[PDB]
Amino acid sequence: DMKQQNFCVVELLPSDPEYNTVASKFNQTCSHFRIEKIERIQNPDLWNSYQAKKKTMDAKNGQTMNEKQLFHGTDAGSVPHVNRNGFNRYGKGTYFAVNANYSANDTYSRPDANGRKHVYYVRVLTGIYTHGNHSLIVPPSKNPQNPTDLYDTVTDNVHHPSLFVAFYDYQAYPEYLITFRK
Amino acid sequence: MDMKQQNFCVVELLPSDPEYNTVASKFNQTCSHFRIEKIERIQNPDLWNSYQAKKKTMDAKNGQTMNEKQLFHGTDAGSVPHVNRNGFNRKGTYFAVNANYSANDTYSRPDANGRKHVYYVRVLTGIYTHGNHSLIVPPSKNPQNPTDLYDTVTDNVHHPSLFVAFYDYQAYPEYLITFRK
Ligand SMILES: C[C@@H](Cn1cc(CNC(=O)CCCC(=O)Nc2cccc(C(N)=O)c2)nn1)c1ccccc1
Ligand SMILES: C[C@@H](Cn1cc(CNC(=O)CCCC(=O)Nc2cccc(C(N)=O)c2)nn1)c1ccccc1
Numbered sequence: 126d127m128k129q130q131n132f133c134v135v136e137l138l139p140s141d142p143e144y145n146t147v148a149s150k151f152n153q154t155c156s157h158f159r160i161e162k163i164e165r166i167q168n169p170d171l172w173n174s175y176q177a178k179k180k181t182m183d184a185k186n187g188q189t190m191n192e193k194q195l196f197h198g199t200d201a202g203s204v205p206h207v208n209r210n211g212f213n214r215y216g217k218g219t220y221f222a223v224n225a226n227y228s229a230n231d232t233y234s235r236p237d238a239n240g241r242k243h244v245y246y247v248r249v250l251t252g253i254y255t256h257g258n259h260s261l262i263v264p265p266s267k268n269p270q271n272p273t274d275l276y277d278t279v280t281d282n283v284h285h286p287s288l289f290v291a292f293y294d295y296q297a298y299p300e301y302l303i304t305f306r307k
Numbered sequence: 308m309d310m311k312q313q314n315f316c317v318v319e320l321l322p323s324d325p326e327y328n329t330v331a332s333k334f335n336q337t338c339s340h341f342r343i344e345k346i347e348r349i350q351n352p353d354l355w356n357s358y359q360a361k362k363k364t365m366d367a368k369n370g371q372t373m374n375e376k377q378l379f380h381g382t383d384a385g386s387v388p389h390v391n392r393n394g395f396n397r398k399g400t401y402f403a404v405n406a407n408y409s410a411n412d413t414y415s416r417p418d419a420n421g422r423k424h425v426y427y428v429r430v431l432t433g434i435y436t437h438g439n440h441s442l443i444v445p446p447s448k449n450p451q452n453p454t455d456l457y458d459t460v461t462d463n464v465h466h467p468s469l470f471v472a473f474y475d476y477q478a479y480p481e482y483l484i485t486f487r488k
Contacts, residue, residue, distance in 0.1 A: 133316040134392070202384035202418050205317070237385045 132168035132208050134302075147246055147301050150194070154226035155305070161241065164302045166208050174295040175211075175248065182252050182277065191277070193251045195221035195289060197299070198234030198244045207245065207299050215279045216261030218292035221249050227287070229305075236306075246301040251289050252277025263292050315351035315391050317483070330427050330482050333377070337407035344422060344485040349391050357476040358394075358429065365433050365458065374433045374458070378402035378470060380426045380480070381414030387424060390480050395428075398443045399460075399473035402430050408468065410486075417487075427482040432470055433458025444473050 137144040147163050182191045197219070199207060212219040222228045225244060234242040255265060257279025264276035277296070280286040291297055320327040327346050334343065365374045380402050382390060403409045406425060415423040436446060438460025445457035458477070462469040472478050 127321060129319040129321070131316065131318050133314065134388070135314050136312040136392070138310060138312070200385070201388070205384075205387050209317070209319075238383075 126170060128170060130168055130170040130209050132166055132171070134208065135165040135167060137163045137165060137301075147303065150246065151196075151225045151244070151303055151305075154224040155229050158229060158242075158305045158307060161304045161306060164304075166299050166302060168208060168211075168299075171209075171211050171295070172298060175250075175298040178293075178295045179250055182250050186252055186277075189253060191250050191252045193223075193249050193289070194300075195223060195247050195249045195251075196225045196228035196244050197221050197247050197297075198228035198230065198242070200235045201237035201241065201243055204243055204302065208302075211295065211299055212247075212291065212297045213294045215257035215259070215281065215288075215290040216264070216292060218261070218279075218290045219297065221247060221289045221291065221297070223287050223289075225303075240306050242305050242307075244303045244305070245299045246303060248298040248300055249289060249291055250277060250296045251280075251291075254278040254280045254283065254286070254289065256280065256283055257290060261290075261292070264290075309353050311353055313351055313353040313392050315349055315354070317391065318348045318350060320346045320348060320482075330484065333427065334379075334406045334425070334484055334486075337405040338410050338486070341410060341423070341486045341488055344487060347483045347485070349480050349483060351391065351394075354392075354394050354476070355479060358431075358479040361474075361476045362431055365431050369433055369458075372434055374431055376404075376430050376432045376470070377481075378404060378428050378430045378432075379406045379409040380428050380478075381409035381411065382424055382426065383416045384418040384422065384424055387483065390426065391483075394476065394480055395472065395478045396475045398441070399471040400478060402428060402470045402472065402478070404468050404470075406484075421487050423486050423488075425484045425486070426480045427484060429479040429481050430470060430472055431458060431477045432461075432472075435459040435461045435464065435467070435470065437461065437464055438471055442471070442473065445471075
C-alpha cells in the first residue's frame with residue numbers, strides 16, 4: 126500500500142455479534158426490509174487518516190463526543206469508489222442520516238438490476254455542529270474575530286438532529302455496508 | 308482463512324509495476340484509443356483455490372490441451388462487488404478474446420461519471436466446440452457417454468473470438484480495468 130487506499134471486504138457471519146449489532150441499529154427503523162449481507166470495509170489508509178482527524182478533533186473539542194454512527198444510502202455503482210476513497214471530494218458536502226429508514230429511500234439507496242439496495246453504516250466526526258443553509262462549500266464560521274475556525278458539520282435541527290452534512294476529507298469512515306431488499 | 312465467505316481485497320496496480328503494463332498492453336492491442344483510469348488486482352483466496360482445483364482436474368483430463376486463456380468481460384459498475392466476491396458463478400458467461408468487443412457500451416456500460424469496467428479474466432476454456440442459443444450446460448462430446456461434456460463453447464472453433472463458460476469456478480476475475488473513451 127503506497128497511499129493507494131487498497132481495501133478488503135469482510136463479509137460478517139450472522140453468528141458474529143458485530144452483525145447482530147449492525148442489524149439491530151438498521152432494524153430500529155428498517156425492520157420491514159430483509160438484509161442479504163453485512164460487510165466490514167477494511168481500508169487501512171482511509172482508517173488511519175480518519176483516526177488522525179478524530180484525535181485532532183478530540184484534543185480541540187474538550188468534553189464533546191465527536192463521533193456518531195450514521196447511515197448513507199448509495200447506488201450499487203458507487204460502492205467500489207466509497208470503499209477506496211470514502212466520501213472524500215445544507216451544503217455541497219456529504220449527507221448522513223441518524224435513522225436508516227431515511228437512507229433506505231430509493232432516491233438514495235437506488236435498487237440495482239437485481240432489486241438490491243445499499244446503505245453504509247458510517248463513523249462520522251460530527252464534532253461541533255450548527256444549523257445550516259443550501260450554499261455551503263465549507264461550514265459557517267464560529268467566531269467573528271477568528272473566522273478560520275469553522276464548524277465540523279451542519280445539521281437540520283441542533284436540539285434533535287435527524288441528519289448531518291460533513292464537508293471535510295477523512296471526516297467519515299464507511300465501516301459497514303448493508304445490502305438488503307424490500 | 309475465510310470460513311468459505313470468499314472475502315476479497317482490491318489492490319490497485321501502480322503504473323510503475325510491470326503487472327499494470329502487461330495488462331495495459333493486452334487491452335491496448337485493440338483499445339489504444341480508450342484511456343485507462345486504473346487497474347486493480349482482485350485477491351479472493353477462496354475463489355482462487357476453487358479455480359485452481361478446477362484447473363488441476365481439467366489439466367489431468369485434457370492431455371496436451373492448453374486449458375487456460377486470459378479473456379475480457381465488460382460489466383456495469385454495479386456488478387463489480389458481486390463479481391469480486393462470487394466471480395461469474397451461478398445461459399453461461401460470455402468472454403471476449405479482444406478487449407474492444409467487451410469495451411462496447413452494451414457490455415461495459417458507462418456509469419454516471421463516464422467510467423467503463425472490463426475484467427481481464429483467467430478462463431478455463433479447455434476443450435471447446437461451436438455453440439448455440441439455449442445452453443444451460445455445454446453439448447455432449449460422445450453419444451455413448453453423454454455425461455462427458457465440452458468445457459466451453461465458442462463462435463468459431465478454428466479462429467475463436469468469443470467463449471461461453473457454464474460451470475462454477477471456471478473463471479477467475481483477476482484484474483479490473485477502469486477506463487473511459
Ligand atoms: C421527486 C423528486 C423529489 N426528491 C428529491 C429528493 C432528494 N432529497 C432531497 O433533496 C433532501 C435534501 C438532501 C438529503 O437530505 N439527503 C440525504 C440525507 C441523509 C442521508 C442521505 C443518504 N444518502 O442516505 C441523503 N427527494 N426527493 C426527485 C427529483 C429528482 C431526483 C429524484 C427524486
Ligand atoms: C456460440 C455462439 C452462439 N450463441 C448465440 C447465443 C445467444 N446469445 C447472444 O447472442 C447474446 C451474447 C452477446 C455477446 O456476444 N456477448 C458477449 C461476448 C463477449 C464478451 C461480453 C462481455 N460481457 O464483455 C459479451 N449464444 N450463443 C456464441 C458464443 C459466444 C458469443 C456469441 C455467440
